[PDB]
Design a protein around this ligand. Structure first.
Ligand SMILES: *[C@@H]1O[C@H](CO[C@@H]2O[C@@H](C)[C@@H](O)[C@@H](O)[C@@H]2O)[C@@H](O[C@@H]2O[C@H](CO)[C@@H](O)[C@H](O)[C@H]2NC(C)=O)[C@H](O)[C@H]1NC(C)=O
Ligand SMILES: *[C@@H]1O[C@H](CO[C@H]2O[C@@H](C)[C@@H](O)[C@@H](O)[C@@H]2O)[C@@H](O[C@@H]2O[C@H](CO)[C@@H](O)[C@H](O)[C@H]2NC(C)=O)[C@H](O)[C@H]1NC(C)=O
Ligand SMILES: [Ca+2]
Ligand SMILES: [Ca+2]
Ligand SMILES: [Ca+2]
Ligand SMILES: [Zn+2]
Length: 396
């Protein structure tokens, strides 16, 4: 079962601590645009994992911190977890929170996270130092720490990735863009074993506090559809560049033949409508079929497929042999044992073929052998069904 398979979503809450606010020269606007750009970069790295980070809360501690932030990363992480559980969570629902801090952590530590703790009330939390002007680098630490919360440990010496480092390398000095196959595996297992429920619901576009981003695969305020870039877009009825529905004149799947219906964009959805077919019983090929499962079965075409372009259905009188019910000329019951045909049913029994314009009765040699296919027209307003010649409207 899946999971696994389904697009997942994290209702993500961010705190910018008072040290970071000071380090940003008290500039809220500059702080917010930085966090927006980092979150979008985190979503780009998480995309192959089918997990989208939806920003639904941002606090900037412009006056004072709400709990004590301390340079021992493990002590802050445990304090943040507790604050999240005891203070935030009763008032603001969220799957996971990160603290972005301007404190300088002990040693060369740049963040810390609990492992595989999505949805836990005390542990779904990570801390991250804003330790470089380059979001390319802080955003990788943000993705790496969240990587830890989603059950992934550090890459062992033998993972993977080309070119730049893997996101879960314990130590990087360049931006990281992809997870190792080993990270990908461990996450897939995390999900199977812990089955974190809270990452299954899709958040409302109106609860996202980050500005809309056209091309992030999540439909936000002022967007109708979002399928990524014009070149990646697999949605036939979305104009990727503008995140807008294509118009309803736009054909998206032409009728392949006459037992087919064309699809057009609806004008108010992103995907090409599923492939509807012409209705069963519908006349086709110049009044020669019925339609059946989007196909037009005919005795002549069955002769042609069996024996080739030089043949057609035999003249009508040949089919009367089938009233014999002997070893060559017969009908079959639904189960389907050999029976003589009733007179009305003869064209639904053994098939007879002839060379074009020649009046013979021949039988394509066949161990079974061959009878009219289901829905084959056997007379006007009639088609073969369970070895019998019957009316539309059964239909079907
Ligand atoms: C945070 O989460 C759980 C604590 O949940 C506890 O579950 C009960 C056992 C009970 O004692 C509750 O009051 C607690 O809140 C800790 O992980 C463990 O969870 C399982 C399942 O309940 C249990 O078998 C373990 O013994 C729990 N650990 C304990 C009680 O020592 C987890 O370690 C906690 N981490 C922090 C930092 O609080
Ligand atoms: C013609 O189709 C029907 C089922 O209707 C559609 O849906 C798909 C499952 C597929 O078969 C497609 O070609 C078709 O347009 C088949 O009839 C049976 O009906 C049930 C329920 O309606 C289906 O779930 C079954 O797959 C099928 N039963 C069995 C055991 O045969 C039908 O088989 C098919 N035409 C033939 C005879 O090949
Ligand atoms: Ca959720
Ligand atoms: Ca979007
Ligand atoms: Ca169609
Ligand atoms: Zn790590």
């Amino acid at each position: 079962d899946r999971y696994l398979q389904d697009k997942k979503y994290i209702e993500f809450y961010v705190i910018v601590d008072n040290r970071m606010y000071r380090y940003y020269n008290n500039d809220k606007p500059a702080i917010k645009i930085k966090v927006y750009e980092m979150i979008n970069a985190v979503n780009t790295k998480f995309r192959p994992l089918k997990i989208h980070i939806a920003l639904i809360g941002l606090e900037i501690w412009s006056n004072k911190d709400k709990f004590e932030v301390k340079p021992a990363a493990s002590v802050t992480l445990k304090s943040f977890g507790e604050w999240r559980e005891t203070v935030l969570l009763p008032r603001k629902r969220n799957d996971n929170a990160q603290l972005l801090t301007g404190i300088d952590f002990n040693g060369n530590t740049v963040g810390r996270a609990y492992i595989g703790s999505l949805c836990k009330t005390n542990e779904s939390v990570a801390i991250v130092q804003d330790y470089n002007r380059r979001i390319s680098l802080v955003a990788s630490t943000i993705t790496h720490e969240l990587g830890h919360n989603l059950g992934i440990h550090h890459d062992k010496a033998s993972c993977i990735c080309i070119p730049g480092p893997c996101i879960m390398l314990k130590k990087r000095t360049a931006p990281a863009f992809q997870f190792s196959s080993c990270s990908i595996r461990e996450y897939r297992e995390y999900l199977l074993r812990d089955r974190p429920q809270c990452i299954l619901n899709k958040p409302l576009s109106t609860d996202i506090v980050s500005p809309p981003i056209c091309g992030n695969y999540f439909v936000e305020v002022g967007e109708e559809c979002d399928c990524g870039s014009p070149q990646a877009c697999q949605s036939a009825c979305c104009n990727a560049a503008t995140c807008q529905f294509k118009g309803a004149e736009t054909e998206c799947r032409v009728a392949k033949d006459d037992c087919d219906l064309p699809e057009l964009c609806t004008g108010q959805s992103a995907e090409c409508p599923t492939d509807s077919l012409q209705r069963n019983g519908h006349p086709c090929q110049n009044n020669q079929s019925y339609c059946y499962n989007g196909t037009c079965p005919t005795l002549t075409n069955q002769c042609i497929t069996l024996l080739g372009p030089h043949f057609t259905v035999s003249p009508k009188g040949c089919f009367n042999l089938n009233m014999r019910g002997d070893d060559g000329s017969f009908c079959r019951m639904e189960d389907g044992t050999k029976i003589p045909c009733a007179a009305k049913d003869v064209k639904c029994g053994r098939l007879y073929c002839t060379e074009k314009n020649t009046m013979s009765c021949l039988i394509p040699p066949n161990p079974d052998g061959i009878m009219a296919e289901p829905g084959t027209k056997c007379g006007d307003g009639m088609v073969c069904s369970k070895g019998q010649c019957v009316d539309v409207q059964t239909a079907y």
